[PDB]
Design a binder for this molecule. Structure first.
Ligand SMILES: [Mg+2]
Lengths: 209, 220
């Protein structure tokens, strides 16, 4: 029955920017609203309760406001460590509905071209009749890349899987791409390459049996 | 401080049953209300159930009534969530949490446990070394790693040297392959001279198959 409609779906803002996230309750919930911060791999952390009360340890750049139906979470001066998904929740009326979340990303941080490390198939894997090349892409910003693979000089698209870039630190991303081959395909070419495009420029690494 | 520790996650077949537990410490267990809250992929947070550790009386969200049972063991400060008639839609990270009185906001949370509801079999990983060499060395820093292939369900965890090695470690999210199995890798960068003086071992834990693998990664 009761809904908590949170907005926007996501936002990207620079370090030092003021960011605002809103939530609309479908009925009057007075000040019975809480806000949480959720980072990948970690449990949600309580930031705010009673709509505007900051929990122990929470930096003062976080503030909440509103009462009745309209609620706002404000971050006055966005910091790199604020990269997370934020959730509103109303907590008095069953079933204590959470909003759908707002993903906050940081833009405008120093740009960095990727490093590319390409690992050949291990001898153990080849002996198990399998082969995987692992392309490890690191220390890049912003966190968008595209990956292309080559067998000798020509494109290979079969057998490729690539991760979505993950933030490794307050400032850099990593990503992985995998090329699955047969041991015969691996051994029969002069080389294979992983070519990473980042902001219109490429870094390519090559391996050979 | 306050601690909440879950156990019980893993793979369950559709229609099956699974019991989670939460071990609480660092507060008067009977002074508070205990909860479970879940986070499904793509979906946000959903409160599941709460229990009064005194009476044992429980309240459930609509979709869990008659299906889930919350219970407590006062003597070992432990809460039990018994889940029956599970569906693919119940795949989620399950958290135990704490609230006070009629304010159902949660100041303390457990670490979460991932429950995957699927008709596929569990499958432990095949772990292969990604050997350091001159070809993976740049500016005197060598990259080495481990490739954790073909497992199901998530998750796997990876540490290095039993947790003694943490700086320069990058452990990637998993990829889902066409085979329906996951793979991930962990890569660590270290000084080239350390390849002769330090042993490097990746410690892989795949709790859903009760499998641990410690793979020595040797230079080649
Ligand atoms: Mg999290």
């Amino acid at each position: 029955r009761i809904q908590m409609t949170q907005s926007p779906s996501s936002l990207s803002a620079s370090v030092g920017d003021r960011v605002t996230i809103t939530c609309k309750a479908s009925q009057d919930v007075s000040i019975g609203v809480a806000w949480y911060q959720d980072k990948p791999g970690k449990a949600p952390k309580l930031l705010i309760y009673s709509a505007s009360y900051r929990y122990t340890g929470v930096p003062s750049r976080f503030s909440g406001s509103g009462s009745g139906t309209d609620f706002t979470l404000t971050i006055s001066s966005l910091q790199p460590e604020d990269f997370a998904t934020y959730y509103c929740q109303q907590y008095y009326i069953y079933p204590y509905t959470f909003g759908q979340g707002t993903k906050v990303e940081i833009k405008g941080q120093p740009k960095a071209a990727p490093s590319v490390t390409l690992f050949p198939p291990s001898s153990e894997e080849l002996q198990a009749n399998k082969a995987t090349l692992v392309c490890y892409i690191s220390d890049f910003y912003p966190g968008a890349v595209t990956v292309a693979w080559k067998a000798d000089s020509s494109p290979v698209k079969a057998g490729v899987e690539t991760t979505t870039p993950s933030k490794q630190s307050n400032n850099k991303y990593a990503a992985w791409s995998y090329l699955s081959l047969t041991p015969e395909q691996w051994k029969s070419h002069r080389s294979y390459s992983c070519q990473v495009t980042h902001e219109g420029s490429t870094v390519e690494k090559t391996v050979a049996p | 401080e306050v601690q909440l520790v879950e156990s019980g996650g893993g793979l369950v077949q559709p229609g099956g049953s699974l019991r989670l537990s939460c071990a609480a410490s660092g507060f008067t267990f009977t002074d508070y209300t205990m909860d479970w809250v879940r986070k499904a992929p793509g979906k946000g947070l959903e409160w599941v159930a709460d229990v009064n550790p005194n009476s044992g009386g429980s309240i459930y969200n609509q979709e869990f009534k008659g299906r889930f049972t919350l219970s407590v063991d006062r003597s070992k400060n432990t809460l039990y969530l018994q889940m029956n008639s599970l569906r693919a839609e119940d795949t989620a990270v399950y958290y135990c949490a704490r609230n006070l009185g009629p304010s159902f906001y949660f100041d303390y949370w457990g670490q979460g446990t991932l429950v995957t509801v699927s008709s596929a079999s569990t499958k432990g990983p095949s772990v292969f070394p990604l050997a350091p060499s001159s070809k993976s060395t740049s500016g005197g820093t060598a990259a080495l790693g481990c490739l954790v292939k073909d497992y199901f369900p998530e998750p796997v965890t990876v540490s290095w040297n039993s947790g003694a090695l943490t700086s320069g470690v990058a452990t990637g999210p998993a990829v889902l392959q066409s085979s329906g199995l996951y793979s991930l890798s962990s890569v660590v960068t270290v000084p080239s001279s350390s390849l002769g003086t330090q042993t490097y071992i990746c410690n892989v834990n795949h709790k859903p198959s009760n499998t641990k693998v410690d793979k020595k990664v040797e230079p080649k």
